Design a protein around this motif. Structure first.
Motif, PDB file in Angstrom:
ATOM      1  N   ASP A 108       0.860  -1.165  -0.149  1.00  0.00           N
ATOM      2  CA  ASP A 108       0.047   0.095  -0.033  1.00  0.00           C
ATOM      3  C   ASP A 108       0.724   1.235   0.079  1.00  0.00           C
ATOM      4  O   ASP A 108       0.717   2.067  -0.825  1.00  0.00           O
ATOM      5  N   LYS A 109       2.017   1.302   1.120  1.00  0.00           N
ATOM      6  CA  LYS A 109       2.806   2.344   0.685  1.00  0.00           C
ATOM      7  C   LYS A 109       3.518   2.664  -0.445  1.00  0.00           C
ATOM      8  O   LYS A 109       3.601   3.788  -0.752  1.00  0.00           O
ATOM      9  N   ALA A 152       2.317   1.817  -3.413  1.00  0.00           N
ATOM     10  CA  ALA A 152       1.494   2.038  -4.208  1.00  0.00           C
ATOM     11  C   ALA A 152       1.276   3.756  -4.355  1.00  0.00           C
ATOM     12  O   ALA A 152       1.009   4.134  -5.493  1.00  0.00           O
ATOM     13  N   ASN A 153       1.641   4.423  -3.193  1.00  0.00           N
ATOM     14  CA  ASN A 153       1.387   5.740  -3.073  1.00  0.00           C
ATOM     15  C   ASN A 153       2.426   6.470  -3.906  1.00  0.00           C
ATOM     16  O   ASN A 153       3.614   6.191  -4.072  1.00  0.00           O
ATOM     17  N   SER A 154       1.901   7.727  -4.625  1.00  0.00           N
ATOM     18  CA  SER A 154       2.849   8.503  -5.424  1.00  0.00           C
ATOM     19  C   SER A 154       4.047   9.144  -4.842  1.00  0.00           C
ATOM     20  O   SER A 154       5.009   9.617  -5.380  1.00  0.00           O
ATOM     21  N   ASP A 155       3.783   9.646  -3.521  1.00  0.00           N
ATOM     22  CA  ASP A 155       4.932  10.391  -2.863  1.00  0.00           C
ATOM     23  C   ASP A 155       6.184   9.518  -2.812  1.00  0.00           C
ATOM     24  O   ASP A 155       6.319   8.293  -2.735  1.00  0.00           O
ATOM     25  N   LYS A 156       7.358  10.193  -2.771  1.00  0.00           N
ATOM     26  CA  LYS A 156       8.561   9.927  -3.096  1.00  0.00           C
ATOM     27  C   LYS A 156       8.923   8.891  -1.675  1.00  0.00           C
ATOM     28  O   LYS A 156       8.652   9.729  -0.631  1.00  0.00           O
ATOM     29  N   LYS A 172      11.865   1.363   0.133  1.00  0.00           N
ATOM     30  CA  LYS A 172      10.841   0.856  -1.005  1.00  0.00           C
ATOM     31  C   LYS A 172      11.184  -0.737  -1.131  1.00  0.00           C
ATOM     32  O   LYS A 172      10.382  -1.624  -1.083  1.00  0.00           O
TER      33      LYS A 172
END
Length: 89
Positions: free
Chosen positions: A3-4, A6-10, A16
Motif C-alpha cells: 500500500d505504501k 503504491a502511493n505516489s509520494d517519494k 521501498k
DNA sequence: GGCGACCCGGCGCCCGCTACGGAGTCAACTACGGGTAGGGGGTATCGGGCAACGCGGCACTGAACACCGTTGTCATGTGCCTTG
C-alpha cells in the motif's frame, strides 16, 4: 508495505525495497496457506462430485473460491481459517 | 555396450445388408441490485372507400348529301290512209 509503495509520494529506495521484500514474504505465506488448504478444498470437491462436473474441475473451481476466501480472511475473526473458508469454497 | 530375448505396450482388424425389443436416473441458502421485458396509453403515418371530372365506343343527330334506280318526259321518228 505494498500500500505504501503504491502511493505516489517519494520514498527512500532502500525503504521501498524493504517494503517490496515484506510484500514478497507475504506472498510466500499466502501460497503456503493455499497449499495447506488444498486438502480442505479437495475434500469439499468430493462433497459435490458426481453431478455432471469432473472431479478435478470441481477441485479447481473450489480452489478459485479458496483464493477468494484467503483474499477476504484475517485474524480479526476469532475463528480458525477452516471454518471461514468452507463457506466460500 | 551392443546384442538379445523378452517383455511389454500398443496397436490394428475382426463377411454383407435389411429388419428388429424397450427404455430416460440420489446430496444450500438468501439477500440485493439492476436491467429488461412486458403491459397499456397515446399519437403520427399509411391504406382503403366514396364523390367530382375525363375519356371512348358507339351511337344518334339524321342532316346532308351521294348512288343507283326508276317511269317521268318528250320532240321527234315508222306505218297506214288519203290525194296528187
Amino acid at each position: 508495505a505494498e500500500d505504501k509503495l503504491a502511493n505516489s509520494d517519494k520514498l527512500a529506495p532502500k525503504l521501498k525495497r524493504e517494503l517490496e521484500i515484506i510484500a514478497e514474504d507475504g506472498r510466500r505465506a499466502k501460497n503456503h496457506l493455499l497449499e495447506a488448504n488444498l486438502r480442505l478444498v479437495v475434500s469439499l470437491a468430493k462433497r459435490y462430485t458426481g453431478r455432471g462436473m469432473l472431479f478435478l474441475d470441481l477441485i479447481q473451481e473450489g480452489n478459485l473460491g479458496l483464493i477468494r476466501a484467503v483474499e477476504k480472511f484475517d485474524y480479526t475473526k476469532g475463528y480458525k481459517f477452516s471454518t471461514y473458508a468452507t463457506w466460500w469454497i
